[PDB]
Amino acid sequence: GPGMGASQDDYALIHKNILHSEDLLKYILETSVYPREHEQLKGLREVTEKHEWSMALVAADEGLFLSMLLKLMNAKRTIEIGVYTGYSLLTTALALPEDGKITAIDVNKSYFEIGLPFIQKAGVEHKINFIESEALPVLDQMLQEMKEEDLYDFAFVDADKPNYANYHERLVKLVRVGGAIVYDNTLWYGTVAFPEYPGLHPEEEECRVSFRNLNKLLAADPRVEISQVSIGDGLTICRRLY
Amino acid sequence: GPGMGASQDDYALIHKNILHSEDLLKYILETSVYPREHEQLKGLREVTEKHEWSMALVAADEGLFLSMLLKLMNAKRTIEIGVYTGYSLLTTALALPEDGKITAIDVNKSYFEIGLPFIQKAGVEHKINFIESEALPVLDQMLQEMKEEDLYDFAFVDADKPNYANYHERLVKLVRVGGAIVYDNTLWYGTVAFPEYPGLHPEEEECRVSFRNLNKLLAADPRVEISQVSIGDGLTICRRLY
Numbered sequence: 167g168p169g170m171g172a173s174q175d176d177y178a179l180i181h182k183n184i185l186h187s188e189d190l191l192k193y194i195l196e197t198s199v200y201p202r203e204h205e206q207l208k209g210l211r212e213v214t215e216k217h218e219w220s221m222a223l224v225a226a227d228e229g230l231f232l233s234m235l236l237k238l239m240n241a242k243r244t245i246e247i248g249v250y251t252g253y254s255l256l257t258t259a260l261a262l263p264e265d266g267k268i269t270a271i272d273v274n275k276s277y278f279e280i281g282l283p284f285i286q287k288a289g290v291e292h293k294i295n296f297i298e299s300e301a302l303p304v305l306d307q308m309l310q311e312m313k314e315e316d317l318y319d320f321a322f323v324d325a326d327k328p329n330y331a332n333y334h335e336r337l338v339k340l341v342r343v344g345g346a347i348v349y350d351n352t353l354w355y356g357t358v359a360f361p362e363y364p365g366l367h368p369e370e371e372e373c374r375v376s377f378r379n380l381n382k383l384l385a386a387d388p389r390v391e392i393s394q395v396s397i398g399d400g401l402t403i404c405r406r407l408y
Numbered sequence: 409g410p411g412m413g414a415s416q417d418d419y420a421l422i423h424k425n426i427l428h429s430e431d432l433l434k435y436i437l438e439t440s441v442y443p444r445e446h447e448q449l450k451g452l453r454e455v456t457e458k459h460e461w462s463m464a465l466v467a468a469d470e471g472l473f474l475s476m477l478l479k480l481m482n483a484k485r486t487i488e489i490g491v492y493t494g495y496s497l498l499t500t501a502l503a504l505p506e507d508g509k510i511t512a513i514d515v516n517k518s519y520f521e522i523g524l525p526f527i528q529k530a531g532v533e534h535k536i537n538f539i540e541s542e543a544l545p546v547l548d549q550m551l552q553e554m555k556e557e558d559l560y561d562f563a564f565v566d567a568d569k570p571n572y573a574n575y576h577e578r579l580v581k582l583v584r585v586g587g588a589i590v591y592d593n594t595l596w597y598g599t600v601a602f603p604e605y606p607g608l609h610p611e612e613e614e615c616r617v618s619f620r621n622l623n624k625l626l627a628a629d630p631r632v633e634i635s636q637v638s639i640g641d642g643l644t645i646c647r648r649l650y
């Protein structure tokens with residue numbers, strides 16, 4: 167209700183990680199990520215680390231992996247669902263060719279305006295069409311207007327986790343055959359490994375249940391082939407078969 | 409030569425995981441890997457788990473990830489350095505198109521012949537050219553023979569870990585611009601995160617030092633872009649820039 171509102175300090179999982187030690191994660195970041203991180207990504211990460219919802223920020227080592235994937239598959243047109251301050255968005259725009267185009271959807275443009283000066287300084291604002299909306303209505307409108315030639319090469323889904331299964335039903339039609347859909351956080355701090363997990367914030371417990379259901383659904387879905395990857399907070403890559 | 413025993417039972421790190429939870433790794437395998445693992449991959453894995461050198465077997469979740477990379481980048485010609493019983497080789501052969509081609513190099517053909525019946529039942533043996541040799545003389549001969557039009561799309565390096573840096577100097581010339589080189593085990597059970605790590609077999613300590621040196625070298629190498637991925641025992645994806 168009325169008060170000071172939602173704080174990430176109310177959340178039980180903010181200090182969890184899927185790797186064995188903080189020392190290993192820190193080693194990966196210092197050895198293999200920070201020396202390869204664009205200066206504007208560094209700046210955007212450092213301001214977002216001070217933001218009240220910093221727990222949502224995509225991991226920097228995951229960012230370099232998404233960039234690698236985009237280049238290896240020669241992605242040109244992508245969609246991002248869940249922008250926040252724009253780290254994965256800027257990662258994607260930097261990875262695409264000069265003529266690459268991104269459709270970026272988030273309910274809260276004020277987060278995006280935190281990253282926008284870094285995006286602009288990186289010279290890649292022209293690649294981004296930002297839509298301030300709930301993603302589901304936008305995706306449903308796209309299904310009525312987009313033609314086969316307009317299909318996306320790549321989708322990154324990092325928005326409200328309980329809705330991933332709903333996003334999936336749209337994105338297997340909006341991503342081209344052979345294209346990729348990447349769902350972020352599908353290991354949810356390791357909590358998905360347990361049928362019951364004590365002491366979670368109600369929103370954290372909802373996401374544990376939804377990800378346990380989503381992970382089973384994707385593994386059974388004959389429209390895609392999958393790879394769940396233990397990077398960041400876990401992600402699942404889906405490649406559309408038909 | 410004469411010295412101390414170096415069988416798998418002599419190693420210290422065999423049971424150590426880079427993920428913090430045995431339950432989490434089991435969850436990934438049971439939920440997202442086994443339901444998507446080819447029947448002949450399952451059979452090949454089950455035999456290899458009983459083998460004298462089972463610690464060297466590539467992780468099954470890493471297998472699905474390598475398959476996804478191969479499909480997303482439309483790889484057609486690849487090279488594997490380090491075959492063992494052939495799990496990553498069969499993964500690769502199943503991923504490639506019908507007319508794909510793999511050059512597979514290993515010093516020990518008897519290991520490969522353990523997995524060969526599974527590769528044959530999968531119907532993809534025809535894609536594989538197995539070369540029984542140390543890899544370095546083969547790569548040096550390839551440098552003298554390979555034309556630009558025959559450069560490999562993809563290279564998987566999983567053989568003798570101290571030699572990775574030597575393999576790299578050849579493979580950045582044998583893989584096409586924009587092609588990928590994947591080095592396996594670059595987190596080495598997490599021991600790379602520490603300047604000193606007590607309790608290791610001398611060969612385990614040698615790999616810890618070599619990977620710490622390799623991880624710095626790749627992070628600084630202008631010929632490639634990199635992504636180190638905390639999957640399996642860690643891997644580093646390199647994409648050749650020029």
Ligand SMILES: Nc1ncnc2c1ncn2[C@@H]1O[C@H](CSCC[C@H](N)C(=O)O)[C@@H](O)[C@H]1O
Nearest residue numbers: 222223224248250254272273300301325326
């Ligand atoms: N229904 C919805 N539709 C679109 N965006 C939503 C949404 N519900 C939540 N979001 C947004 O999804 C974002 C999740 S955080 C995303 C992190 C970002 N991709 C990064 O790289 O760091 C938040 O910004 C939130 O505002």
Ligand SMILES: Nc1ncnc2c1ncn2[C@@H]1O[C@H](CSCC[C@H](N)C(=O)O)[C@@H](O)[C@H]1O
Nearest residue numbers: 464465466490492496514515542543567568
């Ligand atoms: N110098 C060398 N040249 C080529 N292969 C070598 C080598 N030294 C060791 N090897 C081989 O490298 C292999 C490493 S284990 C490889 C694992 C396999 N790729 C999998 O998917 O499970 C062993 O089979 C070993 O025989």
Ligand SMILES: [Mg+2]
Nearest residue numbers: 224324350351
């Ligand atoms: Mg996320």
Ligand SMILES: [Mg+2]
Nearest residue numbers: 466566592593
């Ligand atoms: Mg290996």
